């Protein structure tokens, strides 16, 4: 049994490692195949325990990762891609 205080602290609004889809983050890379197809990014997650509040980012930053791109029939190679992170989150009214 996980204690009430521990479960409460673990689920309250904060930046948690979330697996984001690259193509959702770059919807114009229609013709590319990526490996991996999703990346591990810090994003807001958790609850505010209030229906009128929402967990939102108050501090953001970018992270650079080596992603393989493959354009069928044309080329294949790894290289650097930049992604948005959330350094700080806050329960704000909806």
């Amino acid at each position, epitope marked *: 049994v996980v204690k009430f205080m521990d479960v409460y602290q673990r689920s309250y609004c904060h930046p948690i490692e979330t697996l984001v889809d690259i193509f959702q983050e770059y919807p114009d890379e229609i013709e590319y195949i990526f490996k991996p197809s999703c990346v591990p990014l810090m994003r807001c997650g958790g609850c505010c325990n209030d229906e009128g509040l929402e967990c939102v980012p108050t501090e953001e930053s970018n992270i650079t990762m080596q992603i393989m*791109r493959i*354009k069928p029939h*044309q080329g*294949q*190679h790894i*290289g650097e891609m930049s992604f948005l992170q959330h350094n700080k989150c806050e329960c704000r009214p909806k």
Partner: antibody
Framework: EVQLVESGGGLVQPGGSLRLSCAAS????????MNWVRQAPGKGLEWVGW????????TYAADFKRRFTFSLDTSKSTAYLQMNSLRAEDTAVYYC????????????????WGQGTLVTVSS | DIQMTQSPSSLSASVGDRVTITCSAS??????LNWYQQKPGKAPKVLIY???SLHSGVPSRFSGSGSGTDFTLTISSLQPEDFATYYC?????????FGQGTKVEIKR
């Protein structure tokens, strides 16, 4: 140091076969595509095709689809070019070149090349 | 198959001179063009990619311009070590294709 070394060149009779090899080193072979380019004596450059070192999938310039075959042995970080039914016009220095590491966007230029091996088709 | 036509086929120029090489594509290839330098007995070496981006380790006297069907390579001040044959390559549609080359000789 990133380097590509080729071998397998030499004399081959008309109608014959030969297999060239390109041994990569100094980087992860499976992270960049591999191209094959040729240059007849005293002449220009001609792209033969390329192979995806992660999936094994090859793409040939039309004129080469019929007699050439690209393959790879990742356990040896080597790419191969098998040529069949050779004619005198096939005589040339054959090169292998890897695709580059990108930044932001993709551009298909060849960045590290092998030294090239001369293949001479003669009886 | 896009066809690339380089001009001139060969030129001779003195050290310190500005040299410009031309390239014309048979159809619009946008800015998908690279330039290579090949010396005697060696493999080609990339100088510029994506019309005008200088590859790392290449001297600033080398520059590229253009778009569509017309491109240009420029050596602002020719040096003796610049003797070579220069080639253009398009990466707009497969198969990739090169120009026939321009042989640059140094006049002394």
């Amino acid at each position: 140091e990133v380097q590509l070394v080729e071998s397998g060149g030499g004399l081959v009779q008309p109608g014959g076969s030969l297999r060239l090899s390109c041994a990569a080193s100094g980087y992860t072979f499976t992270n960049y595509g591999m191209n094959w380019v040729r240059q007849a004596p005293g002449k220009g450059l001609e792209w033969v095709g390329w192979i995806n070192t992660y999936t094994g999938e090859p793409t040939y310039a039309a004129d080469f689809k019929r007699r050439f075959t690209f393959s790879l042995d990742t356990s040896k970080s080597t790419a191969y070019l098998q040529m069949n039914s050779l004619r005198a016009e096939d005589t040339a220095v054959y090169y292998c070149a890897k695709y580059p590491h990108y930044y932001g966007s993709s551009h298909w230029y060849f960045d590290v090349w092998g030294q090239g091996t001369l293949v001479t088709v003669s009886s | 198959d896009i066809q690339m036509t380089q001009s001139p086929s060969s030129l001779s120029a003195s050290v310190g001179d500005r040299v410009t090489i031309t390239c014309s594509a048979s159809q619009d290839i946008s800015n998908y063009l690279n330039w290579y330098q090949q010396k005697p007995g060696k493999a080609p070496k990339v100088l510029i990619y994506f019309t005008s981006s200088l590859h790392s380790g290449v001297p600033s006297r080398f520059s590229g311009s253009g778009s569509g069907t017309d491109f240009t390579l420029t050596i602002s001040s020719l040096q003796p070590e610049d003797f070579a044959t220069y080639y253009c390559q398009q990466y707009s549609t497969v198969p990739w294709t090169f120009g026939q080359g321009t042989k640059v000789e140094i006049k002394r």
